[PDB]
Design a protein around this motif. Structure first.
Motif, PDB file in Angstrom:
ATOM      1  N   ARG B   8       0.987  -1.170   0.006  1.00 28.40           N
ATOM      2  CA  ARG B   8       0.083  -0.019   0.054  1.00 28.40           C
ATOM      3  C   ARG B   8       0.907   1.477   0.088  1.00 28.40           C
ATOM      4  N   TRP B  11      -0.679   8.044  -2.747  1.00 30.33           N
ATOM      5  CA  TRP B  11      -0.734   8.733  -3.971  1.00 30.33           C
ATOM      6  C   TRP B  11       0.773   9.497  -4.345  1.00 30.33           C
ATOM      7  N   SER B  12       1.302  10.093  -3.399  1.00 30.50           N
ATOM      8  CA  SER B  12       2.396  10.790  -3.581  1.00 30.50           C
ATOM      9  C   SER B  12       3.595   9.932  -3.870  1.00 30.50           C
ATOM     10  N   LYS B  15       3.286   8.550  -7.250  1.00 25.96           N
ATOM     11  CA  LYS B  15       3.591   9.204  -8.428  1.00 25.96           C
ATOM     12  C   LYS B  15       5.024   9.479  -8.501  1.00 25.96           C
ATOM     13  N   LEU B 780     -15.837   7.618 -12.165  1.00 22.57           N
ATOM     14  CA  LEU B 780     -15.464   8.170 -13.341  1.00 22.57           C
ATOM     15  C   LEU B 780     -14.210   9.230 -13.043  1.00 22.57           C
ATOM     16  N   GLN B 781     -13.576   9.073 -14.147  1.00 19.81           N
ATOM     17  CA  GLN B 781     -12.587   9.991 -14.733  1.00 19.81           C
ATOM     18  C   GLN B 781     -12.526  10.748 -15.948  1.00 19.81           C
ATOM     19  N   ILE B 782     -12.371  11.963 -15.995  1.00 24.32           N
ATOM     20  CA  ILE B 782     -12.608  12.636 -17.230  1.00 24.32           C
ATOM     21  C   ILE B 782     -11.118  13.057 -17.461  1.00 24.32           C
ATOM     22  N   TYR B 783     -10.655  13.255 -18.749  1.00 21.46           N
ATOM     23  CA  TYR B 783      -9.453  14.045 -19.171  1.00 21.46           C
ATOM     24  C   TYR B 783     -10.039  14.997 -19.994  1.00 21.46           C
ATOM     25  N   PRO B 784     -10.294  16.317 -19.394  1.00 17.19           N
ATOM     26  CA  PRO B 784     -10.633  17.529 -20.031  1.00 17.19           C
ATOM     27  C   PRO B 784     -10.173  18.045 -21.245  1.00 17.19           C
ATOM     28  N   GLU B 794       1.102  15.436 -18.801  1.00 19.75           N
ATOM     29  CA  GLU B 794       0.055  15.225 -17.466  1.00 19.75           C
ATOM     30  C   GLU B 794      -1.119  14.456 -17.404  1.00 19.75           C
ATOM     31  N   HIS B 798      -1.198  11.215 -14.862  1.00 22.26           N
ATOM     32  CA  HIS B 798      -2.480  11.199 -13.848  1.00 22.26           C
ATOM     33  C   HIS B 798      -3.344   9.846 -14.230  1.00 22.26           C
ATOM     34  N   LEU B 801      -1.120   7.222 -12.711  1.00 22.54           N
ATOM     35  CA  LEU B 801      -1.129   7.318 -11.327  1.00 22.54           C
ATOM     36  C   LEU B 801      -2.547   6.585 -10.810  1.00 22.54           C
ATOM     37  N   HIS B 805      -3.365   3.345  -8.441  1.00 18.88           N
ATOM     38  CA  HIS B 805      -3.811   3.509  -7.235  1.00 18.88           C
ATOM     39  C   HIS B 805      -5.293   2.714  -6.924  1.00 18.88           C
ATOM     40  N   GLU B 809      -6.013  -0.414  -4.400  1.00 15.49           N
ATOM     41  CA  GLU B 809      -6.979  -0.009  -3.324  1.00 15.49           C
ATOM     42  C   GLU B 809      -8.399  -1.027  -3.561  1.00 15.49           C
ATOM     43  N   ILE B 815      -6.387  -3.844   1.880  1.00 15.75           N
ATOM     44  CA  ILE B 815      -7.591  -3.084   2.250  1.00 15.75           C
ATOM     45  C   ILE B 815      -8.627  -3.478   1.307  1.00 15.75           C
TER      46      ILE B 815
END
Lengths: 820, 820
Positions: B8, B11-12, B15, B780-784, B794, B798, B801, B805, B809, B815
């Motif tokens: 585990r 996030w840092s 990265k 949901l994840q969006i890449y705008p 970037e 992300h 990353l 994660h 998780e 966990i």
């Protein structure tokens, strides 16, 4: 002191819990009193009103009979009589001389007659469809007060009229084309544009002149004032179309802050009717000089209408910054026919006297902002060169109060034929008299239905205010001739919302408190014979009985605390159900925190804020605090965040939270969550940005992330123009500060209606753009079928389910603590 | 077996771990050989090519010197010499006779000479900017092969030409107006529309005639064949604009499956030029009869060009269902001037002989589908009655093979003068000869740069194929006269991507395998004196050296299994690093699974699929399987899912997963995840929907959720028309079966580029609307800032990353077990 961990239910179980507690779960309004005038009959008045009478029922017209006497030993329950034969009806017009109702119900415009010379029905009346040849939906229907045979309405952004007995139908304006796309054809007539409806609550853009001018041949002239808007220079925004299959977007004229509002002006339609009720001719008229010359500095037409006799039109006018208000009388003689021929047009300008001129009967300024309201009453004209009126303002003392004003209708210094432009002050009338009718550390209410009722016979003014408490609205009465003490007419311990009869011998109150659901009751007004100033009330009958204290709803308790800022700040505390001694519980701050809203007051919260109780039942402490900037505390309280939105609000929330944590050891400050919608979502993001030490999770619904994206009317009131407050816009915009969000996941949740035209989805996507750029984690939920509110039940059910599961998994339960 | 759990990391930390493993991290292409013709000099050829010199540098022309002899004890590394010094380049044009390069670099079109009459530069050249009056950007420039002074290009959807010595600039087509907006002006000329670029890989819509017809006056006629498209009836779709601050969408002509494709026709532009390079006149010409009449049943112009002598234009034409292909010769005499006057037009129609007719020199059909390719070689015409050519096809055997064909150019039975319409078979040419050059259970490659090179002296054809293995592409050579033995020229143990010099005395291979990163090497071809037919090769020089066996990369091992469906299926297995005994690890299935793609082959996967190795280093089993439908296994294998996409793919994935589980104890089948993009995202959703017993988590990237939203060219090829496959479209669309998703959260992650124009974001938004309606949870994840690909670094970081994660998780860690 041991941490309480909430029961860890599954998704399916939480859905069941929510469905079971929801399973158990619109009040009468728009009242009107009409006298019977029948000496032998037992009834004095018949009240008409809009209501539902059922959970799944159309909103429709009812009536009840108000008896001349009552049995004072018993409690009269008025029976609801359906006015109509078989969402629904949102509002209605009435013309008293004839008894003619007019209303829109779905696509149709209908009319019925009751209470006039025709008398009073004892059975449901049949709605009479106003027939038409217009292909599209007719909007905003209004009766002509001078002739109840005539109505007007909007069709495809132009004004039409229609006679409901002769069936004649005429178009008055030719400004819009239904077939052309909006990119090229951006003009409308009689219609309030977006910013006016959304940020000033003006929904109409045309006003019937209430009296008819008679002509030589035994006919008449009817008149309509209306605003004409040109949105050609207003920026065009695209918002996703609700039919997602199309993969299309609707166009939308959105004036974002620091860009052009619509080009506006006043116009006058002059409708000539003959002896038989038929249209001779329609002459469209315009201002003798353009709007920008006659009304220097004016950006917004906030309100408009006519004086009781229709001699003058009036308007309440704002400058761009909304720090200057003007009340202006506009004569019909200022309007000349629209003429293409310049030779004939020059003759029409020279024909109208130089003496005829706009009359600024009132002007005021502030260095906070002008809050627009609906209070404006004009007395009959006693003398030709004077006008008396009641207005309300926060400009003098910083609390809204009533003022009786007499202004002198002076002939202007400016002469038009001299061929120059007028100086700013040339139209300003001088103030003869200005008497404060009320005063103190409390406000008179003038928005959201609150207004004044003026008894002209006994020379009194009924109004609503916060004099007894900022947590309760109450009905008050006072003389406008010799303003002395203010008699409260409603009982303490509830907050009231009231309507007073036109005849000033009755009032109705819709009232509630934290414990009891909303009631609606009728009260008779009396004065002792020796003093008409002195006013007493007596309970007459119940219109809507309260359901009574609900099972499985524990109300919160209202607390306060003395802030270091030098204000009392109020709050609501929901204790977690079944407190175990020596245990500290997770906390959920619910927040809005923006202007024009107060969440904390003595009203029933078991309808709208029912899920706060549901959170309490699972073991969450729930807190709500009205920070500085919220309403009902005066202008200085409101002004605290001028130029500085986002910078102060969370200090008040934290100070209130720490107040509660000292006095109550059951509040675990290591597990605090924050949640809100619109401004509340905005502050939920700011809370996590600024004070990540205090707030573990933040759940932001439809958040303003970037103030440059929001509209002119709202954003420039509180923040001014972006060019003159570059640091305020930066500090107040969460998307410009994405690096300040945590690098820890399971802390940020963004929620947004995908079709939101108010706070564009763009706010979220641009925030996400910078969060992604800054390597920051987030959770996201979209509601693809919702706008700014959540209307479809399935979306709301999913929202509540996901919210509870998120709080459980990342704040409340034991598994949440282990995730660090 | 005890369960292994991944560490585990925060996030840092993840990265940081991803950044450290990335810290250490575009090959030469578009080769061309030019002879030196210098008997005294040390070099035989100069090779020009496009490449990227460093990591962040632009793509430009380079060159290298090919020596006449080499030191065979040593290894010659060719040095890259820059061709240009620009005060980038995706492609270039070249004219052998003059030595003129023509290319676009940024907004400018440039020309410069090297390696003809004007000689060979020994330093970088500063190119010459082509002059224009055109305001907007110029696209797709091409040198006229018959005159290197003349170029063509596209500007605002019309064809222009300009002269690079005289500076004359003429517009040839007047089909589009840039001033009028997209909604009303839908015509274009010389441009391939959306579907043909995405789904047929045709990027140009105009073709220079390679030869000039001389005029008796002393000048010449140059010709440009082009397609003219009318997209008026094609549906308009709105896609979010990249500048998110605008809050606008761009309009897009997107022909969704079952709706109108663009109305297409051929046109011919005749440019008359005088003796000294000046234009005399331009005559725009159209087909003597309409396209629909001349080419019955044809929807798509797949490929087009000219025969080498310039006598006929050719085209490869498909019907709507993409089961009929035709190769058609189109004489310039079939075009007549465009005339408004109807009487003058009927004169022109009658002035063209009945003998002039379209010539269908080849036709084929299939019950599966036609795969379009770039192989089509036409030999010089020895007889005017005959045309010889080499074409490739899967229609005879089910595998792509080369066929030499001779067709009789006959006079047709149909006469225009007769005044009727031609029947289906009237234009068909009879087949004199059809020899198979290759055969077997393996394919010739004709896409993504794979093609043939014909040696007309030695009468040989070089090609690429899967003969030795479906996991390796190899170069081969064979006679087209007496076809027999196929000689492989590349060495077994690598997969090769090759091109052959125009002179057929050299070839270059870009090659790699699972262990070794990609290299590019030059090889000299030669024959023994006794037989010109026979080809041997010799290593000459390296162009791009290997990085070497890459540090901190561990390649997978290729496996296979004998499926119950009767095919050998191939896969890749990444074993976990530091593989502990008596332990079982979480498994991650990476998937594409759609047509036209093969993931499992003998190539270096350590650049594009580097993060599969990164997953294995954290202790995940990673599996990739080529299910039925994937390419390089013949048409029958590919056809497995016709009319039923989404119904067979997961069976193969699961079968291969179970095959591995029985042979390896370390695969924990209780913790299997699935992930893919585009078709891989689609199948990831289907995997969770159909087989939630197997797959714990699914991460869907840019998923097709609804086949009616996808385009004509792709969807109808594989699934037919929606009316003829109502069940396949229903069962194949995951948004239509939202109730089948799990009621457990932390199992479904949706990833999507917000600006994706290929797989619209509405696929996700509509899926989410049904998931909301069905009370189902999702992440949901969006890449705008992203479209279908993830281009901005970037966004890629992300994505990686967040994916690590998420897998940690919800699949891998301790966990993740406690969460259920």
């Amino acid at each position: 002191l041991e941490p309480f961990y909430v029961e860890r239910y599954s998704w399916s179980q939480l859905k069941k819990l929510l469905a079971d507690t929801r399973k158990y779960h619109k009040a009468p309004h728009d009242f009107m009193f009409v006298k019977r005038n029948d000496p032998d009959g037992p009834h004095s008045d018949r009240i008409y009103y809009l209501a539902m009478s059922g959970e799944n029922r159309e909103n429709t017209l009812f009536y009840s009979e108000i008896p001349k006497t009552i049995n004072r030993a018993a409690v009269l329950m008025l029976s609801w009589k359906p006015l109509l034969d078989l969402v629904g009806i949102a509002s209605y017009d009435y013309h008293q001389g004839s008894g003619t109702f007019l209303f829109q119900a779905g696509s149709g415009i209908y009319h019925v007659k009751d209470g006039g010379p025709q008398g009073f029905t004892q059975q449901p009346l049949r709605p009479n469809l106003v027939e038409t040849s217009c292909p599209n939906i007719r909007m905003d229907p209004k009766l002509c007060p001078a002739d109840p045979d005539w109505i007007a309405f909007i069709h495809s952004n132009d004004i039409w009229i229609s006679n409901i007995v002769t069936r004649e139908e005429r178009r008055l304006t030719y400004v819009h084309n239904e077939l052309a796309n909006m990119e090229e054809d951006a003009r409308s007539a009689g219609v309030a544009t977006f910013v006016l409806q959304e940020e000033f609550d003006r929904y109409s853009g045309y006003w019937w002149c209430p009296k008819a001018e008679t002509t030589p041949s035994g006919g008449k002239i009817l008149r309509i004032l209306y605003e004409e808007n040109d949105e050609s220079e207003v920026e065009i925004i695209h918002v996703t179309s609700p039919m997602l299959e199309t993969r299309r977007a609707d166009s939308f004229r959105y004036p974002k802050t620091g860009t052009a509002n619509p080009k506006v002006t006043f116009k006058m339609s002059e409708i000539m009717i003959d002896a038989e009720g038929r249209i001779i001719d329609v002459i469209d008229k315009e201002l003798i000089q353009p709007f920008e010359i006659l009304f220097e500095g004016v950006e917004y037409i906030a309100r408009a209408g006519w004086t009781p006799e229709g001699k003058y039109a009036w308007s309440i006018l704002l400058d761009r910054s909304q720090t200057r208000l003007q009340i202006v009388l506009i004569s019909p003689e200022l309007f000349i026919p629209v003429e293409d021929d310049v030779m004939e047009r020059q003759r029409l300008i020279e024909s109208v006297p130089d003496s005829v001129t706009p009359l600024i009967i009132y002007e005021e300024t502030t260095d906070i902002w002008i809050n627009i309201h609906d209070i404006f009453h004009v007395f009959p004209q006693s003398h030709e060169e004077e006008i008396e009126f009641i207005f309300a303002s926060e400009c003098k003392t910083g609390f809204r109060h009533l003022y009786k004003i007499t202004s002198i209708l002076k002939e202007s210094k400016y002469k038009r034929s001299s061929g120059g432009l007028p100086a700013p002050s040339d139209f300003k009338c001088p103030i003869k008299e200005e008497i404060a009718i009320t005063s103190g550390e409390w406000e008179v209410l003038g928005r959201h239905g609150s207004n004044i009722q003026v008894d002209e016979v006994r020379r009194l003014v009924y109004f609503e205010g916060t004099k007894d408490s900022p947590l309760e609205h109450h009905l008050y009465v006072v003389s406008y001739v010799n303003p002395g003490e203010v008699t409260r007419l409603t009982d303490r311990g509830y907050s009231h919302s009231c309507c007073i009869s036109q005849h000033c011998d009755f009032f109705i109150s819709k009232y509630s408190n934290q414990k009891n659901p909303h009631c609606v009751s009728l009260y008779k007004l009396s004065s002792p014979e020796d003093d008409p100033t002195c006013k007493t009330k007596e309970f007459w009958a119940t219109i809507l009985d309260s359901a009574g204290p609900l099972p499985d709803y524990t109300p919160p308790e209202i607390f306060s605390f003395e802030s270091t800022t030098g204000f009392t700040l109020y709050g609501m505390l929901y204790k977690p159900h079944d407190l175990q001694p020596g245990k500290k519980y997770p906390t959920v701050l619910f927040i809005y925190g923006g202007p024009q809203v107060q969440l904390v007051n003595n009203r029933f919260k078991g309808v709208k804020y029912f899920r706060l109780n549901t959170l309490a039942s699972l073991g969450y402490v729930v807190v709500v605090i009205d920070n500085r900037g919220s309403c009902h505390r005066g202008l200085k309280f409101e002004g605290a965040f001028k130029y500085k939105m986002g910078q102060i609000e969370i200090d008040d929330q934290v100070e209130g939270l720490q107040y509660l944590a000292s006095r109550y050891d059951f509040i675990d400050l290591d597990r605090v969550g924050i949640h809100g919608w619109s401004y509340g979502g905005y502050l939920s993001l700011m809370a996590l940005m600024q004070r990540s030490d205090i707030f573990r999770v933040a759940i932001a619904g439809a958040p303003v992330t970037l103030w440059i994206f929001y509209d002119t009317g709202y954003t420039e009131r509180y923040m001014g123009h972006p060019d003159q407050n570059e640091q305020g816009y930066y500090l107040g915009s969460v998307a410009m500060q994405a690096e300040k969000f945590p690098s820890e996941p399971n802390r940020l949740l963004l929620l947004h209606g995908f079709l939101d035209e108010n706070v564009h989805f763009a706010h979220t996507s641009i925030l996400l753009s910078f969060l992604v750029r800054a390597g920051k984690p987030y959770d996201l939920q979209i509601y693809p079928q919702e706008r700014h509110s959540i209307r479809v039940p399935e979306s709301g059910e999913h929202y509540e389910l996901h919210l509870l599961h998120y709080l459980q998994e990342n704040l409340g339960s034991r598994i949440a603590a282990l995730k660090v």
